[PDB]
Design a protein around this ligand. Sequence first.
Ligand SMILES: O=c1ccn([C@@H]2O[C@H](COP(=O)(O)OP(=O)(O)O[C@H]3O[C@H](CO)[C@@H](O)[C@H](O)[C@H]3O)[C@@H](O)[C@H]2O)c(=O)[nH]1
Ligand SMILES: O=c1ccn([C@@H]2O[C@H](COP(=O)(O)OP(=O)(O)O[C@H]3O[C@H](CO)[C@@H](O)[C@H](O)[C@H]3O)[C@@H](O)[C@H]2O)c(=O)[nH]1
Lengths: 435, 439
Amino acid sequence: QRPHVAVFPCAGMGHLLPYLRLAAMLHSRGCAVSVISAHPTISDAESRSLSSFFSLYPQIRSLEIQLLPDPFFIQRESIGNSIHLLRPLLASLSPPLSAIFVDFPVLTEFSPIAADFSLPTYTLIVTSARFFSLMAHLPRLLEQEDDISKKSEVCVPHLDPIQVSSIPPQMLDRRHFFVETITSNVASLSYLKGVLINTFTWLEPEAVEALKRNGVDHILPIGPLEAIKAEESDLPWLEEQAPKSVLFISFGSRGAHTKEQLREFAAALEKSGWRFLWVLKSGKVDREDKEETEDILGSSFLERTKNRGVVIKGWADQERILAHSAIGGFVSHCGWNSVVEAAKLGVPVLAWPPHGDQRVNAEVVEKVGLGLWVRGWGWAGERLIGRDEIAEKLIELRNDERLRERVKEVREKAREERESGGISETLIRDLIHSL
Amino acid sequence: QRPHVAVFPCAGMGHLLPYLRLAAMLHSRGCAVSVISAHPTISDAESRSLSSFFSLYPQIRSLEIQLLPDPFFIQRESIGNSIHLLRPLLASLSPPLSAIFVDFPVLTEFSPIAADFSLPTYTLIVTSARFFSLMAHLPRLLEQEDDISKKSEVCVPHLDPIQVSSIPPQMLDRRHFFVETITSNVASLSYLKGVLINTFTWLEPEAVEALKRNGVDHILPIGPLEAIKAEESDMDLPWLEEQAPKSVLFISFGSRGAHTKEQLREFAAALEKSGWRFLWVLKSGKVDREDKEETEDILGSSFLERTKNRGVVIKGWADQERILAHSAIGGFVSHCGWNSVVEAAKLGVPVLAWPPHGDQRVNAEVVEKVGLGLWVRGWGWAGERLIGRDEIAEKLIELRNDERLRERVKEVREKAREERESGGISETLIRDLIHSLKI
Ligand SMILES: O=c1ccn([C@@H]2O[C@H](COP(=O)(O)OP(=O)(O)O[C@H]3O[C@H](CO)[C@@H](O)[C@H](O)[C@H]3O)[C@@H](O)[C@H]2O)c(=O)[nH]1
Ligand SMILES: O=c1ccn([C@@H]2O[C@H](COP(=O)(O)OP(=O)(O)O[C@H]3O[C@H](CO)[C@@H](O)[C@H](O)[C@H]3O)[C@@H](O)[C@H]2O)c(=O)[nH]1
């Protein structure tokens, strides 16, 4: 017999994928896994990825909740309201779960269910240790009035200061619901058996140690998460390119920028001379609402770059593309999942964080030597950054010998961690044993 | 929970694989899938593919119908005869199918079964939109008094006129069953929820609009279909790995054999003349692998010896989609069956078109419009006239040297890539059908 565990992401591709990856890592290491999904999904992509995952992993079981009656936050509240639907589902499981992994946002709401069933519950953090360090200190931080206006930096104990320019404004307003969501779930970490984070110690040593010293001693640096597998099968344009010559661009699972800004970047691509594969979601937040068809970049750019660039509109297999030998650079939005994959695959990064914790994730990218970053660009829409400025960075990414060498080291280190003797691997095996 | 759907192909690799591809496509996308096959299969390959497919996809399920005791056509007739055998099978099935996809030929014969079962039914059309418009217009066309052979062209409504030389004589002749098959099924096209075609709008914008106008507004352009999972043998791989990129010509004249030995020899001589490196997949053919006793009594020893350095000839079946995908492949000499054209368009391989039978000549007309391939219309149906080595050799040289073609094929590939994107019509249409297909 082998232990049964369930994994439960609330919303977003950024949350969902790591959990699907965690579930596959658990299945590979000897556990029976159930993935719990809340329906209907806000986007086609999470729903499509869930269907795709189940076909790829027949052994993993699908548990679904139908939800009773800005969008991702609303979905988080929908799950919190409908969290009681999990109770009949957990009791029904053929072999009971010895563990469940639930998303950080629903830990408070799920706290009673964990108590009634006496079920050990852990959590997988999808953001950086440094941003998570700030999240844990937020309640103590909000006790003092010192972050309201005259604050250049916030000092989280045991790590160097976080400048206030990299902290999302909603996090610093007590009235805002975002603070309430973080403040409740942070208290809810006390009942967890462990808190899994998708980072490793040598990538973030001060931050991992800062969490342990600041009230999170069950933190487990389990990163990087392994790739979801796929049946082997655009390879051809990529296949036809010389190694290290192609720059991959993604601004996330959602659109980041204004058309004028994107066009400013695009001109920059041309000036740089990089061959590129670019994945564009100019649909803002939802797959379903995105109906634009390269109306964002204009026809002339496609005509001019037709030989040396491919623009994929919508979803792409980003991790799999990153793996390809042709790729030589990544222009990332600095979401922790993408940043970690760049670290894993040793791809040099030009960091362009637009919203949320991505500015702090960019700080980590710069600190480890994984990529180049300009703090002055700021949050999306604050400033217009011109072709000439962007191009200079693109040209640097190409030419920085040191960066390429440092990136290789990040990759070596990332590899060591998922090896048998590795800390991340040791820690997961240690947890599975705890059964 | 998942919708349970079934895919039913009747006969021939050209039909079977596309259904197998659709079935796999449905499975990745949240469907519980069964494949219905008729036994005994006409060819070994058909049998080989089915058995292999199930091993590759354990989750997909096999439903077999045992059959009471030209061949491919005969087999289809047999299937229509044994069509009742389904009724126990559909009844047997748990969970019940949300929808079923059945091949174009037996649409009428399955019509009763669909109605009784109150089961929504679909077709996958394995031919081009351009040929299909001709098939949907055929019933009206026969009604037209002037017999088709006398007229130089036939005008389908809203379509570029189709030249009669491009239309198989069997289609224009009333006595022939083939006419009875096309006309019957077309009429059964009204009971279906949708008709799915392995093409996309860019590839054929006029033909798809015409189908919508001409009484098939439930057509869905679902192309190109996705590639099936593979065995990945490390045996037919080595010569291809050795060669430089884009320097190898791949030749395949179909699932089945196409041409006379004299004709094949004409082409084989031409091939030496071009100077292309090549991979030729050869089949004696007629219709059946089982009956193909002869091996390289078609080409002779001398040719093989001379070209040994730069050529490989494979006799029998090969995994063509995998080969075309290879870095080494630089051109495709094709019979222009639709499944093959799409793979070339989808994979961006330049085509010299040589269609010998059936809708293949119409398909070649599409390859030409698209800029995917080079075609000579004058060559005619297979066996009509011998085409000389020099004439073939000239076309082969052009394939090598045409820079512009290279540009267009690349453009064709991009267009294919787009249809496979998440927001693309082919994906949207398919996802929508699966969503709507709940109950
Ligand atoms: O076209 C795409 C785009 C993304 N991905 C996958 O999506 C993940 C990327 O997610 P991430 O890099 O984390 O970005 P987001 O999902 O946009 O970010 C959300 O989650 C991040 C990690 O928590 C946070 O840092 C952000 O604030 C939050 O908005 C990667 O693993 C990719 O493989 C694709 O597969 N294809
Ligand atoms: O060695 C081989 C030979 C064929 N194939 C595959 O088999 C299929 C063949 O399809 P197609 O190119 O359309 O050939 P046919 O099966 O001969 O096509 C028949 O069916 C088509 C669709 O109705 C018609 O357009 C044609 O005229 C008719 O001959 C494709 O998947 C090929 O890649 C292989 O994988 N390996």
